[PDB]
Amino acid sequence: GADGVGNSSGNWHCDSTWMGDRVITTSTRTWALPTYNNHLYKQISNSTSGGSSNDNAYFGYSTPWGYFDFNRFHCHFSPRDWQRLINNNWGFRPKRLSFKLFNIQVKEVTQNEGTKTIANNLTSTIQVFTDSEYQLPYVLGSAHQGCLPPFPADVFMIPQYGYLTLNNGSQAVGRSSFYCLEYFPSQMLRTGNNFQFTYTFEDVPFHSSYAHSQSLDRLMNPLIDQYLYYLSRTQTTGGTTNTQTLGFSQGGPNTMANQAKNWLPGPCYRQQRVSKTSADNNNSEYSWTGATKYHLNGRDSLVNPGPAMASHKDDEEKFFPQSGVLIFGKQGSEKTNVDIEKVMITDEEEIRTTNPVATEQYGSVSTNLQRGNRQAATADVNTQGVLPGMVWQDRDVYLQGPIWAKIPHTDGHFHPSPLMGGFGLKHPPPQILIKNTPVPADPPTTFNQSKLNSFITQYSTGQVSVEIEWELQKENSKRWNPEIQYTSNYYKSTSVDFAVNTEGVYSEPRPIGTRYLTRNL
Amino acid sequence: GADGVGNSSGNWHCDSTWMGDRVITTSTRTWALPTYNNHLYKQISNSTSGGSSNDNAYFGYSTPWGYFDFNRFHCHFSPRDWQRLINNNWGFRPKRLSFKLFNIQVKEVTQNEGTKTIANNLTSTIQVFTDSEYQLPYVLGSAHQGCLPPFPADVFMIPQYGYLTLNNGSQAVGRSSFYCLEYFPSQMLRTGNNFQFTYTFEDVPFHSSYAHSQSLDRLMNPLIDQYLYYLSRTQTTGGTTNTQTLGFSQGGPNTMANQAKNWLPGPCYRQQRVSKTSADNNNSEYSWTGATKYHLNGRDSLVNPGPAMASHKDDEEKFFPQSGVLIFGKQGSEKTNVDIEKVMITDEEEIRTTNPVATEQYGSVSTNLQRGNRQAATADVNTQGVLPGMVWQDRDVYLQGPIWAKIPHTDGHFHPSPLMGGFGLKHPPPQILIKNTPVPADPPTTFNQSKLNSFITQYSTGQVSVEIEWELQKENSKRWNPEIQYTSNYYKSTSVDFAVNTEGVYSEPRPIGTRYLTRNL
Amino acid sequence: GADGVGNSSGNWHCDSTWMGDRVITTSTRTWALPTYNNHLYKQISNSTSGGSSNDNAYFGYSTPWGYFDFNRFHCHFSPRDWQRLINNNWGFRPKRLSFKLFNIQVKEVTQNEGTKTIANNLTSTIQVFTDSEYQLPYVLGSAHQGCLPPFPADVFMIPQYGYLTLNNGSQAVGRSSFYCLEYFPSQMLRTGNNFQFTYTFEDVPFHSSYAHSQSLDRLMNPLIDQYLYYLSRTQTTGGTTNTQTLGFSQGGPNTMANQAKNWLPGPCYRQQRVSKTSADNNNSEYSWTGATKYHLNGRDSLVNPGPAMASHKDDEEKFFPQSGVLIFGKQGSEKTNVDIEKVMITDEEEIRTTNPVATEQYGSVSTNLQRGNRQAATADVNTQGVLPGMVWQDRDVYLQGPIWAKIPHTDGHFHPSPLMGGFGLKHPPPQILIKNTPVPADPPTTFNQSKLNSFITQYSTGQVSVEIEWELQKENSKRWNPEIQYTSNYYKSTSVDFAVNTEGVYSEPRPIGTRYLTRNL
Ligand SMILES: [Mg+2]
Ligand SMILES: [Mg+2]
Ligand SMILES: [Mg+2]
Ligand SMILES: [Mg+2]
Ligand SMILES: [Mg+2]
Ligand SMILES: [Mg+2]
Ligand SMILES: [Mg+2]
Ligand SMILES: [Mg+2]
Ligand SMILES: [Mg+2]
């Protein structure tokens, strides 16, 4: 679209539409875009931000571009719509996206004698493009701040785009890449113009928005014995002189733990157990030393949140895996060393039906060959890669959590469900990059070859709309008794949950997952 | 409609058109809309406004939206047109509505060094929508200020939209609802754009713009006796020793009070009688203690104005029911404890032909079983719900009074004529909500996740037009003698009634009802 | 249908099918039918059952017929299906019914020498008809035992049909009617035969399966004053000598109780308040003396549950109206003077938004004419019939409660929603009457005129299927925040709710209503 200065280039579209097997979410927001980096590209590294350890070293570039991020479920679903989703469906997945930018306003700022003057610069442009061929480092999928706000009335600033390449400490290597975003075709928009983009999601598995009502070790008929036998006795019982024997039994109703089974619990990468009650924990600094890590090219990274494992076993709700769960901040919570009361620790207990508990061993294996003089020895398995016959559930998604991630362009990518939860896509929603076009201030009247460094101070503002179509897998529960449902609490409160307070601040008081409904295994 | 900055988006349309059985009213006004709540939604309650009693406790939200209110007859009818209506018609009802917003101007306000600068912000928008599916609390119908002014030359400010939900004192409950109006599709308008809406009224009964020339107790032929008998004597007359007897008589011309009749006067909910002359009243505070009330979930509300009852009986014009009549303010009258000379108390004496007097008993009922040792006992009926055979008239409408109300979405709704007077509609003219779109001021040049709280100061102004088509029921009076008509008074005055004074202030000097013409019962 | 002895005449059909705006429920059960009254019709009265008081006197007849009763929601909806209904819909109503009887077995019982022999009587019949023209007293709608069991595996006995006519004490009157059910055409079925019937429900209002999120006294805009005035002062404030005055104010945000309003709360018939905690109640017998009653032809009946009124006001959950709520029994609870822990008292608190609290006055009315020597007097209104402008909600329905009732064939029937809750139908599902055809034992070989009184002992058994199609009004909540939903409790339990225990007994642990979702008023 193209029109004049006094004509609106779009309307406000916020609402959800529920049809048969589909839901279409639409959210509109107002954004503001500053000029970033005074129009420059800059080399950055851990030595440019300060510098401390090799584990945290990097090299990259900060760019003068901003970008759009709507990779959080709350950018699309109101809490009520989320409730409608999770209480009634066994699965969902994204199908298509439509994105629009409109009602663009470019503003000039003049700073003289302490006076603050903001005027419309009717002839200035913004630049917008989509990285539809995935030629730039993809930073969506790294759970960054800068998303479309959950509350439609909230105005937000667009985040600055930067990227990383290869480093050796704070230095670049020959394989290090530099990208110039002006080396891309971009649309130029004045105040009368608008931008639109459409995208189709690839076929991805439905997210499992249910919990299992059976455990993997309890799939048998509890009334009938097995025809198969297990070794039940290795030593004679009774008398004074106990000797070697071999006794075999059939597993049955009272020996379910010994029964022959067809399947195995999902893979494990053991995490340390932390109590939500500080007094139950060790008096030492183990946030790093006791952490579960991966080692890549001489540096350690936290495995966070890592493989989908259950948070805790039965009646152990006060424990969580050190870095094995998503942890969200309560409204207004600060960046550093905030108390437990300022965060919301997610609970993945529902997957304990098929997935090992994050803080316990996967199991026990034999480590020797027993004989007359050597007793049978076993060891705990704290890391268990995939085995044939293993089954598992992936991590849940949350209203305030991420939606998708880009699957790394690699030769191998086993079960590429992103570990933070969500949908793994080889070709995800592309990065939408935006910047204010530099407008030079008055040049000298004698030629000078130097690049111009005096610009008129500008920012831009407008509206953004994002529409996502989602496919649903409706609940078909043949269970007799009522199910668990997400419900607001009936009792009297100073404020209503998922609303604004007396000062106009919107808050999300808790994480809301998707696994309320149940099904058999 | 969509056009440029130098082109008008509409014309001024104010006038009435009288046809055969229809009148089309059109009024145009100029409005101004500020930014409300600094773009925020806020939780409000009786503790946020102060707090005193449980009877006045509430919980709700203030929104940054304004709304249009033209739910008063004087927004559509000039006093002369009202006179034409009431002097010539026995009834009327609304049929259709057309609403337009045009000649939108968005203005930026700059406050530096005490200097007041107002400039046009040619690229800013307003947002407008109609709640056509009645998904929001409906506040029209609660006789609020903020209507289109009666005088076409008067410029008005649009009122702020807020709503209530359930409360327990100043606190919310689980059933309490929060609504975000940005969760609705709304049209975005710049200075070249306009908005239009059309609506059709459902079939509603005509308002009875007449008074009855017969009373319910005087429908008989005054020359002829009845064939039916009543009990006229229970004791012998004459002598020294009076004994029990049963004597029966036929009602006739001199015993109309005893005649058999087919109908009953309308229902009653008794109000206290107050004299317009202070000296005739009791020396106590009874505005609340002597008030007629309803009790709902532990709190009392005034029954105001309540069931349509006649204001007073014959030659008792100085008395009014405590809260049983509409009371309007004279021009410029203040909010609190104003004298009687500052208000205009309506008079519903015309309905005393079928409806009980508001301040008297409905009648008398027997309370015992009389016999030799027990005398017949009766009691006053101060509350009388509907009985088969009851007939009544609804409350009159006034030039300065309300037009419609939304019938509550309930299972039962007996004779849903709104008690303040007017037309009860299940699907009334929808709420038209409007706001100024927030325009952020210059954002920081380093990304910050916090919602933006610095905006450019703006307001909007434009024109609004409302057109209503009304259906008329023409007077067909077969009466020989002249009727009562509303007339201006012939005598010399300092000012003419329903005009402006020497300072340019328009005033409405009296309430004007609709019941001048008469008809039989 | 008609077939042989070795061929099944029908299949087991139990399941629900959810479509767009419809749900079809199907339940199949096994029944047993004895011979009732040894094939006789008998006159019954309070003198035939014992006799105590005139309030309990009756006259009627016991018949040898049984009948089918499926007038309870749990005969059709599993608890899970009920949850699906109430969490997702704003209303529902019945549309059509299909009824089938099949796999009929007639059994002969022989009692000789203490030996119990049961054999098939392949040539015996049962008789079945529908009272499709409503020519018999309709006893469905009187909340009787004998319904299709909620649990599909439970086998039930069909109840005996009897009816009442007019009485004067234990005696009949001339207007008393006697009905012979053999004076009707009935189908005769042997073991190879089946019976089918179809019915269509008349247009009835949807049941309101929601609660209001607004109260009737809080429909105003909380930010704006009214243009209307009320009488706020009757006496001067300040000084030593307080005198009569008239002061008027406009209702506003802090005077919501005084604001002019259009509507009135629903009708009232006051009930006594009883605490669920025995120690808070009076130490007297008031179950009858303190009861709310109606008086009909010299006898008193309890008003039970009576007009739909709210059970209690805010923070008063321990109180219930004496006979103003439905009270269900827990599984196995006995007929007489059972403890509070054996019953389940329903709570109608959700309707307090429009309906008066059952145990409080409707309001207050004026009872006199105040003047200099007479102070303003008011009285409580404990009975309030319908007034124009009243709005209300009807009583909720429950999973274990009744579905419909027959509207009495009368000249007048105001808002004929059955007071126990449910759907009022002029032409309800007809009575389905069934009996075992008498099979005489060996007659004498010499003629005797006396009716035969020696029969072979028989009973019958078979299956019954009932299919109801229901229309739904889907929830379209534009509320931002999550709603209340019915949910099973997440915590560990010895048994799961709405399941069987270790002995195979099914129980319904609580009443489940339909008002979880909310909407504005
Ligand atoms: Mg977000
Ligand atoms: Mg847990
Ligand atoms: Mg690659
Ligand atoms: Mg007005
Ligand atoms: Mg008068
Ligand atoms: Mg409603
Ligand atoms: Mg039952
Ligand atoms: Mg309650
Ligand atoms: Mg009848």
Author numbering:
A (entry chain A), B (entry chain A), C (entry chain A): 217 to 737
Which statements did the authors publish about this structure?
Here we report an analysis, now complete at 1.56 Å resolution. By FSC0.143 gold standard, the resolution is estimated to be 1.56 Å. Inspection of the map clearly showed the presence of a first hydration shell of solvent water molecules bound to many of the polar protein groups. In the absence of cross-validation methods, modeling was conservative, adding solvent molecules only where peaks in the map exceeded 1.8 σ, totaling 265 per protein subunit or an average of one water per two amino acids. Presumptive divalent ions could also be seen, coordinated by histidine ring nitrogens. Here, at 1.56 Å, the AAV-DJ structure is refined with a full complement of hydrogens, most of which are clearly defined in the map. The 249 atoms within the nine strands, βA–βG, of the core subunit jellyroll approximate this, with mean B, = 3.3 Å2. However, the quality varies from excellent in the β-barrel (CC = 0.88 for grid points within 2 Å of the 249 atoms) to marginal, the marginal regions includingthe 24 disordered loop residues with breaks in backbone continuity that are only breached in the unsharpened map. For seven of thirteen histidines in an AAV-DJ VP3, the map indicates which nitrogen(s) of a histidine side chain are protonated; two others show the entire imidazole ring, but without distinctive hydrogens at Nε or Nδ; while four exhibit disorder that precludes imidazole proton assignment with confidence. Thus, we are observing, at 1.56 Å resolution, the effects of local environmental pKa perturbations of the nitrogen atoms of half of the histidines.
